[PDB]
């Protein structure tokens, strides 16, 4: 909401999010208590909508622009877990860090056969 | 070669001359000019190598066990 206020004032803004995965994990923690049936790996049934309704308003517009960097935790290093898998589609440049490269002491541990950009 | 108490015959494996060895050398040059390479005769190594190449193909193990390498 603050990033959007600065955007609409005509400015151009930087928005850094510290870990967007926790935003869906907090929804998974509460989902079952709201009385909703579990989905594929215990995730809430509304995972993709809860994620899209947020990431669709973090965008630049003709009146001003938002440049954003988001850290995205992937659980158990599984890049096919539903949450990273649904997050991939919402980004222009995706940088994929891997443990098998960090263990070689090569930092930043970017995997160049999976990093990509529009 | 006859020696005081020994005699040895240093036989050789094939007829030797000059008409023959020269043909051998001519063919040895020809095979080098036109790059003519013959196969060996080892059918055992051939079969083992082909099985080993087919078994290791599309194996992709190192992508799977996260061996950093």
Automatic annotation (TrEMBL), chain B:
Location of the ATP synthase epsilon subunit C-terminal domain: 19-63
Domain of life: Bacteria
Location(s) in or outside the cell: Cell membrane
Quaternary organization: F-type ATPases have 2 components, CF(1) - the catalytic core - and CF(0) - the membrane proton channel. CF(1) has five subunits: alpha(3), beta(3), gamma(1), delta(1), epsilon(1). CF(0) has three main subunits: a, b and c.
Similarity comment: Belongs to the ATPase epsilon chain family.
Its biological purpose: Produces ATP from ADP in the presence of a proton gradient across the membrane.
Record protein name field: ATP synthase epsilon chain
Source species: Escherichia coli O145:NM
Lineage, uppermost ranks: Bacteria, Pseudomonadati, Pseudomonadota, Gammaproteobacteria, Enterobacterales
Full-protein interval shown: 71 to 139 of 139
């Amino acid at each position: 909401t603050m990033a959007e206020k600065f955007r609409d004032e005509g400015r151009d803004v930087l928005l850094f999010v510290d870990n967007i995965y926790r935003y869906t994990l907090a929804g998974t923690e509460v989902s079952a208590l709201l009385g909703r049936m579990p989905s594929a790996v215990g995730y809430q049934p509304t995972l993709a909508e809860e994620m899209g309704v947020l990431q669709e308003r973090i965008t630049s517009t003709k009146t001003g622009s938002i440049t954003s960097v988001q850290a995205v935790y992937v659980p158990a290093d599984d890049l096919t877990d539903p949450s990273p898998a649904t997050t991939f589609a919402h980004l222009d440049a995706t940088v994929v860090l891997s443990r098998q490269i960090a263990s070689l002491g090569i930092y930043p541990a970017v995997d160049p056969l999976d990093s990509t950009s529009r | 070669e006859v020696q005081p108490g020994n005699v040895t015959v240093l036989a050789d494996t094939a007829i030797r001359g000059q008409d023959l060895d020269e043909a051998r050398a001519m063919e040895a040059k020809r095979k080098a000019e036109e790059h003519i390479s013959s196969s060996h005769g080892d059918v055992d190594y051939a079969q083992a190598s082909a099985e080993l190449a087919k078994a290791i193909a599309q194996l992709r193990v190192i992508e799977l066990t996260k061996k950093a390498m």
